[model samples]
Target: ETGDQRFGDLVFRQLAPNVWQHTSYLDMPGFGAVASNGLIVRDGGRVLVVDTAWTDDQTAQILNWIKQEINLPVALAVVTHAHQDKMGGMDALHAAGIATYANALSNQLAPQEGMVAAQHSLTFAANGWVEPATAPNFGPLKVFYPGPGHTSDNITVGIDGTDIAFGGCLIKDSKAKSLGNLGDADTEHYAASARAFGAAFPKASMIVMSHSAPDSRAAITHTARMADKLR
Candidate 1:
């Protein structure tokens, strides 16, 4: 009805060939039904998920859909940060025996946020990985950490071989009037972090942001400028 292809509380929207935006609804205490975005990348007969739904049950639906509908084994799932919108499905991923990835800081901070850590640590020193050793479903990869803005552990996942960057909550949509959440924001470094993110994914023509629609590369710089002024 809302133009989103729905399955329970999850919605799917095509982003590009073999790339989809999966959304799950969260009924917040004051916000009504808030929608969050995650990426479903299918290529070379395997799957790579960037982020997950708000709860384990919702995320399980994602895994079930991929296994049944897409008929592909999810090689690995990356949580771009420790926030609920990104790492909410940690338990599901781990339970399914799917390789999970997240920044080292994310692992360190997740428990404090009421979420568990990803099974594997993806650090700035190591950066990223190409999953499913047998094939290249997501490599040569680049999950860059441009410092922090939305959260100290925030990171961006570059969709290998494409111009799309799954920036999670660090990059805001074009229509976003503000950065959205500042509860854990690093105001001092936010501007520089945004700029660094822009430089890191310069070829990214489109950036997928959580909680809002995907926007163009301009959103990166626009965010940099916004964070600068806000700082």
Candidate 2:
């Protein structure tokens, strides 16, 4: 039921109907090849992307494929977090005249953390920083701030009809036994934060991690359990 599409070195794997995961590699000196996951959503010939490749060049390559092959215009690009793998290609998206969005905290903290801010930002309640006054939607995709896990501004996205959740880096994959990166994470509230995320998407049949293959709904439970171990 899954297939693969390639554009140069980047690989897009069909994870579900109309849902593709664009995989790109980053060469970390010590870690060698580190893969990053981004989502591409296709609905009625229109496209919406979540995150971007690690660089503008890579981002352009995928955008070209989406245009030339898929023939769908990318309506919106969502930066799930402030990390390079997530928002690194915003410059290219903007150059293409594609609209881009992110959580307000991500916009506020991204520049301070050495990442560029998105063209648009969505604000949420100051207390939890999770409940937006009005949730942003592009086609069937809806953005949710499930509280801070991997980063203070990390957000998960839900596909309304597909029942798929893009957990960004807040939810880990099957390969991860512990929280992958905590340089900007809230370890003390990690478990509760993930639980809040899970609560928001009770119908999620699959959860996509930021750096690994898609997983069953159990990925949500696994993340919360791992956070407990971190305590």
Candidate 3:
């Protein structure tokens, strides 16, 4: 061995036997430092992927890890947000016959809408919008409408077994301030959304934002404190 510290990046460090996280996150222009972390949750012979980050080296690396780590077929792709950074690979996953889950309004907000060739019309019509018909819920992973905050269709995903609520953009760590900006959110109803987030899962032990790590209960309290100051 040459005793080279510079060779550390090549080390095959494992976060979990199945789940992995990139060492550092890539910075996005409009968005702050963009990082992606996810888990390969398996239950009852079905494999589920949580939060497929934007199509980038991050996504590729994560996918590469999954391929090498274990050979469980992906059954579902859960999108925690409507952001491209969280949902860009949805079409790829969809092509693999992986069922996707997101808020109802997200389907309407999705720009391309899978295959609507003419833009106005969609192939999977239940009226309008080409969206998946059903969502998969295993045990206590409850998906519910908590109103909108960061976006019109933002929803929270909670793990009843673990008390972890993927708050998306609703609640981020206090170390990260600012709701960042709500271009597509209703200003008057923003706090209301926060309030709903508060009421939705009062017992949630951890709240994970779309971008950052899970926030503690104090962060949720702080979010409510800051929301009071929101206009």
Candidate 4:
């Protein structure tokens, strides 16, 4: 039976027939074991990935798992933000020759965060969303920058075919007690972004978040509600 698999500090769990959630862990000072989640969408012989682990080595495990287990190659990747948890293995992606994409702001802030600037820049509209017609499509995956939330440069993606939304860190898990980390938060616009995110993927029955297991659209609403209470 083909089931979820783990490689080193990374775990690849199936979310759909061709979609997997790559979960990686980091040790924070007071937070203990912190888990980060990313999306992997496989179409034919190629894969499109969202975000990476906390380190290049860990990220390599993801590439290795796919190459060895699935026997497919990752064609491209999109780093959600400038934070380490989102793009720590950007160099690995670069070395693999996979075209990596990120927002202009994230590229500008990557150096200070010890991450590599994405090889390609994804442009978003003034309303903080990537127009689907102009977005880089990898199968049914489309990326969107939902204004700003957890991080000023945070972005989210959705899979139209699967009705799944990889909210990254922009939206939280339904179980989340509170907005996990707000170190780089644009509190002023957080609520608006959260709402926009939910509206953007109105049909997304499954919402994949970074720190928690995939939940329903309630996670999007949960984040929006929590953000509203921030003030």
Per-model TM values vs. the true structure: 0.89, 0.91, 0.72, 0.94
Give me the runs in candidate 4 sitting further than 4 Å from their true place.
131-137, 181-183
TM-score of structure candidate 4 = 0.94
**What do the candidate models score in CA lDDT, each in turn?**
0.80, 0.82, 0.54, 0.86
Q: How much is 54 displaced in model 1, in angstroms?
A: 0.5
How close to the true structure is residue 154 of candidate 2, measured as C-alpha lDDT? 89
Q: Candidate 4 at 123: error in angstroms?
A: 0.7
Model 3 lowest lDDT segment of ten: 115-124
By lDDT, is 1 or 4 better? 4
Give the candidate order by descending TM-score.
4, 2, 1, 3
Tens-digit lDDT track of model 1 for 105-172:
88899889999998887655532232234223355346778887999889887776788887788888
The residue pairs in collision within model 4 are none
Off by more than 4 A, model 1: 1-3, 126-141, 181-183
Question: Which has the greatest TM-score?
Answer: 4
What residue runs in model 3 are displaced by over 4 Å at the alpha carbon?
A: 1-24, 29-32, 37-39, 112-133, 137-139
Q: Could you give candidate 4's per-residue lDDT for residues 23-139 as a string of tens digits? A: 899888998999999988888879889898989999988888888878877888988999888899988888887888888889998999888899888788877677554446556
Error of 1 at 140 (Å): 5.3
Residues 109-200, model 2: lDDT tens digits: 88887788988887666443334444454777777787878888988888878878888889887567678755788888889888888887
